[PDB]
Amino acid sequence: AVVKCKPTSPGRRHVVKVVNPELHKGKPFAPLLEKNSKSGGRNNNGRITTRHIGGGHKQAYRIVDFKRNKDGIPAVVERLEYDPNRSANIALVLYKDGERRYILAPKGLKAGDQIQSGVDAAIKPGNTLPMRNIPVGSTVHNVEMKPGKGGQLARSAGTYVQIVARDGAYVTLRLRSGEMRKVEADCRATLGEVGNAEHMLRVLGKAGAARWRGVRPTVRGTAMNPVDHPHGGGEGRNFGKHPVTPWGVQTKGKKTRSNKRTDKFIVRRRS
């Protein structure tokens, strides 16, 4: 539920919270937890390689099952959980054999719902099948790009993919980007949309709220000296250049895709 905060202080006036009362209030399932310590956007040379990453809250990594390989064995949804590592919620599912796993929580999935994977699975949300066994027209998510590799497409809160055509070895997918893309029909997909579609409606409301998420400030190129950025310099606010990245590449329309290897599988670019 999307709830506007009352303006009892300047930092609250514009806050809009997304409050889901279904989410488990307790601690997560400890056998499926790992540490993921933070990078500060620094690589193994110790250099910043992505700017604007630092701090924020500590977060345990939940091992989420993107492969959905455990075919034939039904699973019941025990609870939905908050996952700090991603926009989607996750669902703790219990298999009949007593194995527990986390899956991306589809829209509509609730505690008590059954799910199953494999060719024989029913066409209902949460069920994972090879896309050759999914009816053309189906909305799916957590789609594999290579058979066996695990879901890579449509994992973010509220996302999904339509299977729009099948032709031999390949299905064609409409991605959220709008790209039409071919993928092997043996690639698995989970039925339905990723849940937590309200995710996008949150309004952080204050500087600090972005800092909690580990986002450090962006200094505009034009606020700098020439030595620091192509945009830097000027007495007063000047500009008088084509906008570029800090490394001098044009940043307003110039295309940067360069992958001849995967061009064959793009039917139509997002445009």
Q: Which residues of the chain form contacts with Mg ion (CB under 5 A)? A: 52, 218, 236
Find which of Mg ion, RNA, none residue 236 binds, CB within 5 to 8 Å per kind.
Answer: Mg ion
Pull the structure tokens for residue 148.
């066996």
Name the residue type at position 228.
Answer: D
Residue number with CB closer to Mg ion (54 or 74): 54
Residue number with CB closer to Mg ion (95 or 265): 265
Residue number with CB closer to RNA (130 or 196): 196
Residue number with CB closer to RNA (44 or 137): 44
Find which of Mg ion, RNA, none residue 60 binds, CB within 5 to 8 Å per kind.
Answer: RNA
Residue 164: name the closest of 155, 153, 175 by CA.
175
DSSP string for 193-238? -BS-GGGGG-B--SHHHHHHTTBPPPPPGGGS-TTT-TT---SSS-
User: Least Å distance between CB 234 and Mg ion?
Assistant: 7
Residues 204, 49: Cα–Cα separation, whole Å: 26
Residues 166, 228: Cα–Cα separation, whole Å: 51
Residue number with CB closer to Mg ion (19 or 223): 223
DSSP string for 108-158? T--TT-EE-BSTT--SSTT-EEEGGGSPTT-EEESEESSTTS-EEES-STT
Find which of Mg ion, RNA, none residue 47 binds, CB within 5 to 8 Å per kind.
Answer: RNA
User: Least Å distance between CB 253 and Mg ion?
Assistant: 19
User: Least Å distance between CB 123 and RNA?
Assistant: 19
User: Least Å distance between CB 165 and RNA?
Assistant: 16
User: Least Å distance between CB 136 and RNA?
Assistant: 19
